[PDB]
Amino acid sequence: PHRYRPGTVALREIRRYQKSTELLIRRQPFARVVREICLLFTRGVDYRWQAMALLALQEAAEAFLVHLLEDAYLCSLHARRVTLYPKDLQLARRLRGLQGEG
Amino acid sequence: PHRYRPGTVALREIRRYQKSTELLIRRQPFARVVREICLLFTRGVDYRWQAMALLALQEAAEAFLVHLLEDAYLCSLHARRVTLYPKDLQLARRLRG
Amino acid sequence: RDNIQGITKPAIRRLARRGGVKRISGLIYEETRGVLKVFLENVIRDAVTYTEHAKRKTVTAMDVVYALKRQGRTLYGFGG
Amino acid sequence: NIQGITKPAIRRLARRGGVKRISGLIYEETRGVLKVFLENVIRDAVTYTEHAKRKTVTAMDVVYALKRQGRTLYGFGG
Amino acid sequence: IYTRSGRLVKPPLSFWCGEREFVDRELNVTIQKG
Amino acid sequence: IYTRSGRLVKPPLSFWCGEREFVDRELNVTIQKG
Amino acid sequence: KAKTRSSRAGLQFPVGRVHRLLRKGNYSERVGAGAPVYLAAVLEYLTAEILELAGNAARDNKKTRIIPRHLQLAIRNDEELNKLLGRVTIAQGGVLPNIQAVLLP
Amino acid sequence: RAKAKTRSSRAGLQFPVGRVHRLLRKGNYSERVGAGAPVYLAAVLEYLTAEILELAGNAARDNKKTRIIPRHLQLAIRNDEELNKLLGRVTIAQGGVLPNIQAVLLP
Amino acid sequence: RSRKESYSIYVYKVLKQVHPDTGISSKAMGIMNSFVNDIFERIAGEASRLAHYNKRSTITSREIQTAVRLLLPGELAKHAVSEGTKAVTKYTS
Amino acid sequence: KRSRKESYSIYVYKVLKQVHPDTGISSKAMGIMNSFVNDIFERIAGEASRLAHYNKRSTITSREIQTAVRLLLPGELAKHAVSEGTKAVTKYTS
DNA sequence: TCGATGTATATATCTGACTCGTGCCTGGAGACTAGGGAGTAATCCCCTTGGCGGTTAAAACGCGGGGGACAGCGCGTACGTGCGTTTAAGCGGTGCTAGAGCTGTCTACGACCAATTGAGCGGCCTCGGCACCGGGATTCTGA
DNA sequence: TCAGAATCCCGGTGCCGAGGCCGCTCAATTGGTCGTAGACAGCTCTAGCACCGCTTAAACGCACGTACGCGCTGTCCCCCGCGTTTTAACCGCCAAGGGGATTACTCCCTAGTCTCCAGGCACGAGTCAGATATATACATCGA
């Protein structure tokens, strides 16, 4: 039968996903996570969330994650590797810390 | 005779220069460099620098360079080398910029 | 099923693909989930503080905008 | 006179940064980085002192330029 | 290690590994870890 | 490419490599390479 | 008769509204006459540059309506304009398509 | 008229309250300012100053020196979990760096 | 309801002026609104700080020029100062 | 003679003689204290002004300063700052 | 080097929001007082020369060698990839109510201001932490 | 393990910077108007949350394969560590005037207001890109 080589399918995914602008995380689970975190922070008070606020939060989180993964893969390529590794994320967050953390 | 193995003097230098807090760049060359840059920027109009104006600039430059070198060496040790290479500075400036 | 597991492996893979990543290790997902959790914690705490100062019992999309702007990442397209 | 920043001085700065081994090409890169940083800071300081219709750049202008650039500086300023 | 106020001062934590100081609505600090 | 104003729009340059634009009191740009 | 201050200077952006924002925005005790017109001129020039780039990007995409994707493509492809908006994220803007040469076989 | 008591004395604070109130009005922050805002701000400032000074004095005493110097200030500030984050983007004149040699280099 | 003032007519006018046969959707138009507001905030804040640093209580035409010099980079700054000077010169007449 | 320049040197010294009575302070350290106090004051006042403006008000009350403190200080510092400020304002009210 | 197997672009073909249009308020255009800048002016101080010069502490050049480190070859495992389930997201319509959002309206509150007067600046000045002067020590490396 | 040699401790000296002291002078406290900002009630109506049915994408297993990362050549080369010569930074120093920085002054430009009016804002009406079916040059593994 037919079977693509390992890697030539991920390139198509990269090209497809750098072209579109739709959100990548499922909407409902992200809203549930946001509600849980807000409830845990506010200690039992039920706060209502607008429809637009969840969307804005999801957009910001997705952009931040994409940029962080870009920097992590930059580090991985610097280390003479093509695989993203957990230490790469830690190094990327360390190089742009308290100034860029917030 | 007596000859220390390579490397064991770097650690002593590191401790000696980290314990103390003085400036690590001579005043006159840095002042001349700053004046040259200001003269080139202003394009021909002489500018006078106060006594404390040069000191603050030197302090800021020294602190920035020290922190950048720390980040670059961290990048190198991630890259599994003990030597600070030029590409490490470029990576450090790219990631935090 | 814990909520933080709602961000599944395919979602992280798609985010990495948008980020240019070609190959992914099996231990990335937990670290990414932790980073997302801490970012959400910070932003939501700031937004809830902004809302509570206004004597409101529901948070709006504008409060999230000020929270993100204060944290350092300005957002465009939601009023300011 | 960018050569005024001597080679041992870069070594001393690296030693204060915990650097144990230095390549031979690091010095030119460090000189370039120092030059660009100084260019930006001096540009902002010169603009600040120009707005005040002054002819001597004071430490306050340098402090304000550094604060605007992102790195606050304590001490100087009185 | 304590202060006059009483906050437990310790050497700075490693945020890059997930360690953080959680803060709630009532400002009660909960020390977290990676 | 040129704008209706007349300035030359250029792709972003590798600032980490030292490439930089020179400004002056005349605000005349000068592309500088690293 | 009535003559708007925006039309006197040939400015599309308002001058009265900008002056009101400057006065009511607790920026300073007093504001001069030329500050609102200068602000309006600068804002109009920046908006015009953004719109030129966005329109060219939209034309290159075989469209006639400007969208966040076009604004993101135009803003991040100009150096002088990317630096000004470096710390800004644009909703539904995507990313600039690039793949590092090492990955390409 | 009777005797006059400073607002710092009334509130039991060492930092000035009239000066903070004047700086709030003259700084163009809002059209009007309340009456408890300067007291609140002065209390916060005094707490922060006391924390910094106490840590600096402890660091100076650990060095067998009876005078606080910028090196002592840097040592106090950079060894705190929260105070480091509050002053993360700040360079202190004549402060040096924390002694930190990583374990990989050690023979 | 309540009036919600925004830079709508002006943005559409500039789009008409510079690209005669194109339109802008709602999302991109709100993005442009936010961009204009952000730039105005930046310039006004820098001008206020410049006015306070020299112990002055007036935002003259000079202060905005120096704020534009400080914030906008390079050619953008040059063209912005040129256009602003042209506009104020035209207004004075 | 010369023009008066205002600084927090005397108040910082007064606070110093409350936690370490036998310890002095240099001049550069005094300047650093002045700069730090001014920076923190500017941060708090700016955040209070922004919070007042976002709610369409024209008054910086103690509530705005309290919220700015809650926003600008991490964790234990924030908690202790709110506690001390509330205590000081309560003592002032009487 | 070609067959063809998935395929993601081009080719034609029906449909809901952006740009029209118009009420209609609510926010923009003009004279005139008064404090904030512009221009002026003697004064002193600090900054840059233009030099003094000398001294001594870095800086530069050179040589020997020891350890990084880069290229390269081997093993094994794990993360990529295609195919058969099942599980929770997405869409649409109901509905109920919590809660934003606009209006009325006074009341406590902060701006404004003459008048004192004492806290907080500036200039002086001793003396004691502190840096510097000189004299014995534990840790690294060849034998 | 023994032998150089750099470092820290220890005591004695001279110094200049830092705590008080005195004098003085602006600005903060006391005390009292006077507009008005917003805190409190009241009402409308509008989105937000919970639910019910129906239609479809992640999860878990299974077989290659190629990325990588210690381990040994290997080797080689280049960056320390030290010695010897060079040089220029820096510390006291005369000086003197350009420009900051006064005071310190004296004389001309925007804010608030009342009168008038038009230009953006909100509320209805009409299609271009979104989606649906071919189709079709891409390109890419395996012989």
JSON list of C-alpha atoms (C1' of nucleotides) in Angstrom, two decimals, chain G residues 1-6 8 16-17 20 29-30 65, chain K residues 10-11 17-19 27-30 34-37:
[
{"chain": "G", "resi": 1, "resn": "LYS", "atom": "CA", "xyz": [-19.64, 80.75, 9.21]},
{"chain": "G", "resi": 2, "resn": "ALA", "atom": "CA", "xyz": [-18.83, 77.44, 10.89]},
{"chain": "G", "resi": 3, "resn": "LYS", "atom": "CA", "xyz": [-15.48, 76.00, 9.78]},
{"chain": "G", "resi": 4, "resn": "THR", "atom": "CA", "xyz": [-14.18, 72.78, 11.33]},
{"chain": "G", "resi": 5, "resn": "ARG", "atom": "CA", "xyz": [-10.59, 72.90, 12.56]},
{"chain": "G", "resi": 6, "resn": "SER", "atom": "CA", "xyz": [-9.99, 69.52, 10.91]},
{"chain": "G", "resi": 8, "resn": "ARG", "atom": "CA", "xyz": [-8.53, 74.10, 7.97]},
{"chain": "G", "resi": 16, "resn": "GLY", "atom": "CA", "xyz": [-11.75, 69.15, 18.32]},
{"chain": "G", "resi": 17, "resn": "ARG", "atom": "CA", "xyz": [-12.15, 65.58, 19.55]},
{"chain": "G", "resi": 20, "resn": "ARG", "atom": "CA", "xyz": [-11.12, 67.34, 24.16]},
{"chain": "G", "resi": 29, "resn": "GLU", "atom": "CA", "xyz": [-2.81, 71.45, 33.22]},
{"chain": "G", "resi": 30, "resn": "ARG", "atom": "CA", "xyz": [-2.98, 73.29, 29.88]},
{"chain": "G", "resi": 65, "resn": "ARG", "atom": "CA", "xyz": [-11.99, 43.78, 1.92]},
{"chain": "K", "resi": 10, "resn": "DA", "atom": "C1'", "xyz": [-8.36, 26.83, -9.94]},
{"chain": "K", "resi": 11, "resn": "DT", "atom": "C1'", "xyz": [-13.02, 26.37, -12.22]},
{"chain": "K", "resi": 17, "resn": "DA", "atom": "C1'", "xyz": [-23.51, 40.84, 6.56]},
{"chain": "K", "resi": 18, "resn": "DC", "atom": "C1'", "xyz": [-21.04, 46.03, 5.07]},
{"chain": "K", "resi": 19, "resn": "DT", "atom": "C1'", "xyz": [-22.33, 50.14, 2.95]},
{"chain": "K", "resi": 27, "resn": "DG", "atom": "C1'", "xyz": [-20.89, 68.07, 21.27]},
{"chain": "K", "resi": 28, "resn": "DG", "atom": "C1'", "xyz": [-18.18, 71.58, 18.46]},
{"chain": "K", "resi": 29, "resn": "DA", "atom": "C1'", "xyz": [-17.23, 77.35, 16.91]},
{"chain": "K", "resi": 30, "resn": "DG", "atom": "C1'", "xyz": [-16.45, 82.92, 18.96]},
{"chain": "K", "resi": 34, "resn": "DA", "atom": "C1'", "xyz": [-5.40, 86.45, 34.55]},
{"chain": "K", "resi": 35, "resn": "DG", "atom": "C1'", "xyz": [-1.51, 83.66, 35.64]},
{"chain": "K", "resi": 36, "resn": "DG", "atom": "C1'", "xyz": [2.51, 81.09, 32.88]},
{"chain": "K", "resi": 37, "resn": "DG", "atom": "C1'", "xyz": [6.38, 81.52, 29.64]}
]
